[PDB]
Design a protein around this ligand. Structure first.
Ligand SMILES: COC(=O)[C@H](C)NC(=O)[C@@H](CC(N)=O)NC(=O)CCCc1ccc(Br)cc1
Ligand SMILES: COC(=O)[C@H](C)NC(=O)[C@@H](CC(N)=O)NC(=O)CCCc1ccc(Br)cc1
Ligand SMILES: CCCCCC/C=C\CCCCCCCC(=O)OC[C@@H](O)CO
Ligand SMILES: CCCCCC/C=C\CCCCCCCC(=O)OC[C@@H](O)CO
Ligand SMILES: CCCCCC/C=C\CCCCCCCC(=O)OC[C@@H](O)CO
Ligand SMILES: CCCCCC/C=C\CCCCCCCC(=O)OC[C@@H](O)CO
Ligand SMILES: CCCCCC/C=C\CCCCCCCC(=O)OC[C@@H](O)CO
Ligand SMILES: CCCCCC/C=C\CCCCCCCC(=O)OC[C@@H](O)CO
Ligand SMILES: NC(=O)C[C@@H](NC(=O)CCCc1ccc(Br)cc1)C(=O)O
Ligand SMILES: NC(=O)C[C@@H](NC(=O)CCCc1ccc(Br)cc1)C(=O)O
Ligand SMILES: [Cl-]
Ligand SMILES: [Cl-]
Ligand SMILES: [Cl-]
Ligand SMILES: [Cl-]
Ligand SMILES: [Cl-]
Ligand SMILES: [Cl-]
Lengths: 453, 453
């Protein structure tokens, strides 16, 4: 019944400019009164506008969907959170101290399973004939199940496989029949792959200071953790369902109430006593404040609810940015006290900037060697031999490239260049190449500069 | 009425061994039933035992004392938290955007003042004829007063100066008459300097893997933030007063109740909605959980209260360790759920280890140059000239030392080597020295190896 808040709009434009995301869509609910902020382009090359129809990957905001469906099957008596995972995924052996470990459904709901960080690299790589249980079989857990909170995205991929086993249905179908169809979220879907979705934003990723179109992987097994697709009107319906459950049938209502119950049975750090529930963080400080970010290789998003004040906040963007991950908290500060802190830092940006300077140094280092060599070749001389000369100068770059290829596997067991390339800036690949190229021209110069008679 | 908890004792011994602190004293209260854990040596060289009489610097757990006295003067009508600091410290000009800023008593209570981190270096350096207002005069604030939470130790030194101005008494005297004498904390004192305190632990600091005796500065102006001295029985009385206020006079009771009221008028981060009150952190998660650590150059400590369960936890140690800063949370996890996470990392240890490897590399680099040079001098030859040779080879180490001396001031304006040496491991000083020593022997070798005819 009145214009939207211009200080709110200012904040969001500012964070959009700092984030450099091509598209940003935001919706703020405050006791029915909703405000919408829909800016930028969903596709840069074709100048396709960000509209309310624009579809986004939800990232880890997918987990609230998966977790709620788990709580629906629990509420219907088809599952127990105390059930052992082997009852539903019989081939998933997971070891602690060399011995098969008992993992419960609760362990995956609450990230108390022990799966190493590298299970993200396996689940996100498309593997067309491999079930989740095979991709994770014989993984070495970091700690005894239940012993601490340790976030791992693939925990919710295990839960998607449980859903399918319990129902005998595809994950796509269960989400539709249990969530999107009952709630009326007619533009939300769990995808089956990288099939073409009309209205989906193109996804972008920072490279040399600018957003670069990035075609990210979309592995069918990883959809329950990362790849539910939605729109801003559907996410407002999502928000409104969590805030207003009267109109909802009792099984969905009960499941929701059980979905916001955080796991208190883990050690808490001195500066963080926040609990994780069924795909949400639960914070009692200036709360209840229920929240979750969504970080994909080339999408990012955030959601936060303050149900006692009837507040819901969702942001969607087609680039991975920490400024979008934090924007919901910024907007909550704004609604709460009318102020907000400066833009947080961003790992992709800092890394991208570090790599611009590093490849520039390699050019200056390389051009110093080229200009120095042409000055030698022009001022002096110029008036099976070239074989052994071309052999010693070519092994060094090929040997520098050999060590470069294995270095990720060694310094961090479980990760590979494929994973690094998916998540890091577009500029990462110029670091190895400028290195082997420099190591090429350096070895050649010294091999030839020893031929001076 | 029963033996102390052996799983608790195990935890504390383990964290003591991992921390490597020479002395550790811990007290846990649970509804009257207290347990005590008093281990190690207060002085290593003389093998002086850690006893209940052993006195410790409280670090930033001093601030709860200062803050409570502030709230006593507020409760007595001698001060308002909304009062401008210039009313009591008339010469302290503090600038925001080149212009004198209005700072309140509340700004310093709640760390919403804008004082840069480097004000710690000024307040901790003894300055015998300088008031706090002069040490801070014309400082450039990081942000508009009140605009965010930003911890700075010197904020409580400003409050100690307010106490003295309001009362016309020394800080030592006000603490005694308003806190330690009424509560019966007969071994707690705000010190005036580095005068000899009988029973005080020696303080230690990590160096080359081992604790090294360290005589830290003790500036009179910085006592309200860092240097209140207490004992474990006195800290149990402290804890018990905060938990049990009936027996207390109403002014002290009221001041205490106002001392646990956190400042909600600052932006909160997505992962941290904890408030700061009058020298305590206030956390509603699995709470109220009221806590504060104490980190000095060569002491560390922690305190945490869970008043609804009548729980108080204090730890005191005579070395700066993150394992002691986190131990209170570990013990709270233990009491709460019977488990606890692994030992957190420690910055001093990681830095000390990094420097051991760096100075070892400099020896290997240096010994490679020495052995290579004696092999040249013995195999070959050995059968105003030495002046210009000794001049070119001596400026390089003295010029490397010149750049080394200024580098802290440049990379982080406001800090100097004096500050670095106070807080970092004993091994920090071998990094510049091995560098200038290496830069000495490298320049000499090349200057002499060019004399080969
Ligand atoms: C400097 O500021 C920060 O670091 C802020 C505070 N943190 C972040 O931005 C986090 C998001 C978060 N809040 O968790 N982003 C990431 O973790 C993604 C990094 C991905 C990546 C991978 C390989 C390479 Br090579 C480069 C980058
Ligand atoms: C690796 O693990 C960590 O970093 C943990 C998580 N953090 C810490 O230990 C913090 C304590 C804290 N919890 O705030 N310790 C310090 O900040 C003191 C560092 C002092 C210092 C100064 C100069 C130089 Br040279 C070297 C050291
Ligand atoms: C190698 C090729 C470089 C040309 C593109 C440079 C990227 C544009 C700015 C990247 C950045 O944000 O960094 C700032 C600073 O480094 C600029 O120098
Ligand atoms: C140059 C090499 C360094 C690149 C390191 C990868 C990205 C670092 C940031 C990061 O790891 O994010 C932290 C966040 O995830 C914590 O939860
Ligand atoms: C081989 C040697 C190349 C030199 C250094 C290695 C660079 C790694 C890039 C890469 O191999 O990408 C992995 C690919 O399979 C997935 O995108
Ligand atoms: C230079 C002089 C060195 C002698 C003392 C070395 C310190 C002892 C161990 C320090 C440490 O904890 O590091 C471990 C590893 O670096 C040992 O090599
Ligand atoms: C080698 C050079 C690096 C030394 C850096 C100083 C200590 C770093 C750890 C630190 O700054 O602690 C973080 C904590 O204070 C956050 O609140
Ligand atoms: C001068 C040059 C020395 C070479 C490198 C500088 C090392 C700094 C040590 C130092 O100067 O300590 C400051 C002292 O005043 C307070 O303890
Ligand atoms: N796509 C998903 O599975 C969703 C998932 N996102 C993440 O885990 C962010 C990965 C961040 C990261 C990447 C590379 C490196 Br190297 C360091 C850090 C989640 O947040 O649940
Ligand atoms: N002694 C006091 O004033 C108490 C005060 N302690 C601190 O601030 C810890 C300083 C930590 C640090 C030191 C050097 C560098 Br480089 C980085 C970080 C507090 O916690 O209030
Ligand atoms: Cl079904
Ligand atoms: Cl199918
Ligand atoms: Cl309702
Ligand atoms: Cl008085
Ligand atoms: Cl005096
Ligand atoms: Cl009482």
């Amino acid at each position: 019944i009145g214009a939207q808040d211009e200080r709110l709009s200012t904040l969001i434009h500012q964070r959009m400019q700092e984030a450099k995301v091509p598209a940003l869509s935001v919706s703020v609910t405050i006791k029915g009164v909703r405000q919408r902020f829909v800016y930028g382009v969903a596709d840069v090359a074709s100048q396709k506008a960000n509209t309310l129809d624009t579809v986004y990957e939800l990232g880890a905001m997918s987990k609230a969907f998966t977790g709620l469906v788990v709580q629906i099957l629990i509420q219907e008596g088809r599952l127990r959170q105390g059930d052992d995972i082997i009852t539903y995924l019989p081939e998933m052996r997971l070891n602690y101290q060399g011995k098969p470990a008992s993992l419960t459904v609760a362990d995956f709901l609450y990230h108390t399973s022990g799966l190493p960080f590298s299970t993200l690299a396996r689940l996100e790589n498309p593997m067309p004939g491999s079930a989740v249980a095979q991709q994770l079989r014989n993984e070495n857990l970091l700690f005894a199940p239940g012993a601490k909170f340790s976030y791992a995205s693939a925990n919710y991929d295990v839960l998607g496989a449980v859903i399918e086993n319990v129902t005998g249905k595809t994950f796509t179908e269960v989400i539709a029949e249990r969530l999107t169809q009952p709630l009326g979220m007619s533009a939300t879907v769990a995808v089956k792959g990288d099939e073409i979705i009309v209205n989906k934003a193109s996804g972008y990723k920072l490279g040399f200071g600018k957003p670069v179109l990035f075609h990210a992987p979309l592995a069918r097994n990883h959809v329950p953790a990362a790849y539910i697709h939605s729109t801003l009107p559907d996410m407002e319906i999502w928000i409104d369902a969590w805030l207003h459950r009267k109109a909802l049938p009792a099984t969905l209502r009960e499941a929701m109430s059980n979905s916001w119950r955080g796991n208190s049975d883990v050690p808490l750090a001195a500066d963080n006593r926040i609990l994780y529930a069924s795909g949400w963080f639960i914070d009692q400080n200036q709360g209840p404040y229920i929240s979750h970010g969504g970080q994909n290789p080339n999408f990012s998003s955030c959601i936060a609810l303050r149900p006692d004040q009837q507040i819901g906040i969702v942001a969607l963007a087609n680039m991975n940015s920490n400024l979008i991950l934090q924007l919901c908290a910024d907007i909550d500060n704004y609604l709460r006290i009318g102020k907000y802190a400066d833009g947080a830092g961003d790992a992709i940006t800092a890394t991208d900037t570090l790599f611009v300077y590093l490849t520039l140094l390699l050019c200056f280092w390389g051009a110093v060697v080229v200009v120095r060599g042409a000055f030698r070749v022009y001022r002096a001389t110029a008036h099976r031999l070239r074989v052994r000369d071309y052999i010693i100068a070519l092994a060094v770059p090929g040997l520098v490239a050999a060590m470069l290829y294995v270095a990720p596997g060694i310094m961090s067991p479980g990760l590979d260049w494929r994973f690094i390339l998916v998540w890091g800036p577009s500029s990462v690949l110029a670091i190895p190449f400028g290195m082997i190229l420099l190591a090429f021209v350096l070895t050649l110069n010294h091999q030839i500069k020893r031929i001076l008679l």
